[PDB]
């Protein structure tokens, strides 16, 4: 788990995201889609986006970014006590959306990238460490739910 100090760092970093949830969410999804085009194919409603310019101009993509980061933020604020929040997300992502855990790794990495991109010099080594642990815990708890379901891809 994370220490109390680590959780405080995570939620301090999260304040940056909360100042511009839509902008952070958009950039995270664009980073995901451009770095890993296979991920776009899981989204019937984003498949039509043929260029990054189109992605940037998509108001629905920004909207989904808000949905994604709002859900993640609610989970992070539980500081690991997130079974009720996380279980349904894991199950919808496995059973309905068919999202391999690899893609959760990709989006976790995208979040770290976007934080540095939007806040260069203001996302310190301790902060990166703590946020990485939180995202690993999130991913790992999802992975346990995936194993329960026998879901791979
Ligand atoms: C931080 C990690 C993620 C969070 C917090 C998150 C959150 C959400 C939420 C709240 C929804 C709407 C409710 C639901 O269907 O459960 C959703 C829908 C969806 N998610 Fe995720 N998600 C994450 C990662 C991913 C990734 C990596 C992919 C694919 C590469 C993905 C694919 C989808 C798809 C296809 C939908 C349905 C979208 C629609 O057509 O409305 N998610 N996600």
Ligand 1 in contact with 101 (CB < 6 A)?
no
Q: Which residues, other chains included, contact 17 with Cβ-Cβ below 8 Å and sequence gap of 6+?
A: 24, 69, 73, 115
Contacts of 60 (CB under 8 A, 6+ apart): 45, 46
User: What's the reported resolution, in angstroms, to a tenth?
Assistant: 1.2
Reading the block at residue 84, the tokens are: 């009720």
- Residue closest via CA to ligand 1's atom 35 equals 43
| CA–CA dist 102, 15 (Å, integer) | 27
Domain ranges across the chain: 1-153
Experimental technique of record? X-ray
Q: Identify the architecture of domain 1-153 in CATH.
A: Orthogonal Bundle (1.10)
Task: Evaluate: CB of 94 within 6 angstroms of ligand 1.
Answer: no
- For 113, the token pair is 């990238």
């Amino acid at each position: 788990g994370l220490s109390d100090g680590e959780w405080q760092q995570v939620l301090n970093v999260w304040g940056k995201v909360e100042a511009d949830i839509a902008g952070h969410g958009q950039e995270v999804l664009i980073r995901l889609f451009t770095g890993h085009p296979e991920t776009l194919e899981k989204f019937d409603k984003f498949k039509h986006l043929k260029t990054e310019a189109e992605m940037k101009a998509s108001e629905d993509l920004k909207k989904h970014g808000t949905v994604v980061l709002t859900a993640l933020g609610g989970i992070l604020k539980k500081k690991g006590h997130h079974e009720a929040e996380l279980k349904p997300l894991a199950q919808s992502h496995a059973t309905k959306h068919k999202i391999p855990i690899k893609y959760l790794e990709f989006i976790s990495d995208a979040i770290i990238h976007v934080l540095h991109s939007k806040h260069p010099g203001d996302f310190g080594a301790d902060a990166q460490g703590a946020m990485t642990k939180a995202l690993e815990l999130f991913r790992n708890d999802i992975a346990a739910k995936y194993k329960e379901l026998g879901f791979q891809g």
